[PDB]
Amino acid sequence: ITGTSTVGVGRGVLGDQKNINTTYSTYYYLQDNTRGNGIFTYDAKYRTTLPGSLWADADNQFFASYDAPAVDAHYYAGVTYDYYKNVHNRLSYDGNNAAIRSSVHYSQGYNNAFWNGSQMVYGDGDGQTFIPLSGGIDVVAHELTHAVTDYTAGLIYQNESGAINEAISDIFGTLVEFYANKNPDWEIGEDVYTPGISGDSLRSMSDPAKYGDPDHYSKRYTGTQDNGGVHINSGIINKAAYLISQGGTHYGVSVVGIGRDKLGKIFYRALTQYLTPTSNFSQLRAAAVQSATDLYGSTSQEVASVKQAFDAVGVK
């Protein structure tokens, strides 16, 4: 809407206070004009019609329980925008400052979040499996990264290309989590998953097998569930990315870590310059090797470490 940029204050899903960029025109709307062509957050009102209503608030204070998922969707979308702009010189998901839209309170007891081709969408969870999913910065950045992928590599959401698609979202979701530097880790969704169980998460990049996901190509899932295992075989690529960044020895294969920033540079370049809609795991390895070669040279430790990491997960 047309109005003047304002700064509200609220509490997120985990009870943390934060300022949010709003817009004033009769009401205070969750519309952040300070980033690109805007970040807009909507109320889906427990229904499934999208996007719903642009979030309006009478007093610019967002401390009600019902406000918390909106506060976090809005704020963490801003953090993710900042990461792509400041770290990769990328202006929003299309590279041309496209408006970023999110809807919260999607459906009733909805244990998921997603990018629908046009916007991010967050369930509230059923209170047992999940609390409102926008409470997880890695979750928010995972979903917005699907938009980046849609506009760049375009990895088809099935089989190996879809597992790369998922891994790309987990990798950058985690790198955004580290960029915000609150409580960062190599796990996915720990802040919103199972409020009654401490120490777990949806997936682990450091040890995908902890949650039943493969950590080696020989253990890949080949059935039809989950679009051919896109959230399962992502563990093979997640483990390789973890190894590139942090190093380690895995199935007897030693990898020299090069750190999170170089991992992000290599995979961002692969995503935007080399990967295609049909790329498989072997093609991702080639794309990552070529990206590391572009950035650091063919004789570099970075190229050597990328090869070691894909070797360790059985991807040639």
As annotated, the binding site for Ca(2+) includes 57, 59, 61, 138, 177, 183, 185, 187, 190, 193-194, 197, 200
Min CB(166)–Zn ion separation in Å: 5
Q: Does the protein bind Ca ion through residue 302 (CB under 5 A)?
A: no
Q: Does the protein bind Ca ion through residue 143 (CB under 5 A)?
A: no
> Cβ closer to Zn ion: 146 or 250?
146
Distance separating alpha carbons of residues 85 and 137, to the nearest angstrom: 17
Partner residues linked to 22 by β-bridges: 6
CB atoms within 10 A of CB 2: 6
Q: Does the protein bind Ca ion through residue 138 (CB under 5 A)?
A: yes
What does the block give as tokens for 196?
Answer: 């009654």
Query: Binder to Ca ion among 5, 183, 218, 273 (CB under 5 A)?
Result: 183
Helix, strand, coil % in the chain, rounded to nearest 5: 40, 20, 40
Q: Does the protein bind Ca ion through residue 17 (CB under 5 A)?
A: no
Q: Which residues contact 284 (CB under 8 A, 6 or more apart)?
A: 164, 237, 270, 275, 315
Query: For residues 11-48, b (16+ Cβ closer than 10 Å) or e, as one string?
Result: bbbeeeebebbbbeeebbbbbbbebbebbbbbbbeeee
List the catalytic residue out of 143, 160, 216, 302.
143
**From Zn ion, Ca ion, none, interface partner of 118 (C-beta below 5 to 8 A by class):** none
What does the block give as tokens for 25?
Answer: 């025109």
Whether residue 105 lies in the annotated active site: no
- List the binding residues for Zn(2+): 142, 146, 166
Whether residue 143 lies in the annotated active site: yes
What is the widest separation between alpha-carbon atoms in the chain? Answer: 64
Question: Radius of gyration over alpha carbons of the chain, in Å?
Answer: 19
Min CB(55)–Ca ion separation in Å: 10
Size of the site for Ca ion (CB under 5 A): 12
Q: 3-class DSSP state for residue 124?
A: coil
What does the block give as tokens for 91?
Answer: 């202006």
**From Ca ion, Zn ion, none, interface partner of 283 (C-beta below 5 to 8 A by class):** none
Q: Does the protein bind Zn ion through residue 169 (CB under 5 A)?
A: yes
List the catalytic residue out of 105, 231, 250, 302.
231
Distance separating alpha carbons of residues 277 and 40, to the nearest angstrom: 29
**From Zn ion, Ca ion, none, interface partner of 15 (C-beta below 5 to 8 A by class):** none
> Cβ closer to Ca ion: 188 or 236?
188
Q: What residues make contact with Zn ion under the rule CB under 5 A? A: 169
Q: What residues make contact with Ca ion under the rule CB under 5 A? A: 57, 59, 61, 138, 177, 183, 185, 187, 193-194, 197, 200
- Just list the catalytic residues: 143, 231
